């Protein structure tokens, strides 16, 4: 763990950044999930109609 200090610091900082970006768009994430649930079903229906 000591010899890999730079790597753990770097991924800790990157986790901080990614988590901050994901939390600042919480409503965006909820909307994305709620819209991704039926849109894939609709795409599947469209494709299976022209299968």
């Amino acid at each position: 763990q000591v010899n890999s200090g730079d790597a753990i610091q770097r991924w800790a900082a990157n986790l901080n950044t990614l988590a901050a970006q994901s939390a600042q768009n919480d409503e965006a994430l909820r909307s994305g999930l709620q819209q991704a649930a039926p849109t894939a079903d609709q795409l599947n229906a469209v494709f299976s109609d022209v299968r």
């Binding site: 991704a36 849109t39 795409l43 599947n44 299968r51």
Partner: protein, 51 residues
């Protein structure tokens, strides 16, 4: 995730069946497209005169 499974399977099937067809069609359309472009000016006048 379930909708993604279904849509991915259906779309992958359709694309695997109809991808090389489209690729070779778009490859073979180059001479016909160049020919149609080259002799475009004699299209409107030809149709007008025949009408």
């Amino acid at each position: 995730l379930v909708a993604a499974v279904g849509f991915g399977n259906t779309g992958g099937d359709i694309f695997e069946r109809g991808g090389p067809y489209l690729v070779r069609g778009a490859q073979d359309l180059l001479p016909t497209s160049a020919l149609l472009d080259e002799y475009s000016p004699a299209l409107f006048c030809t149709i007008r005169n025949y009408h």
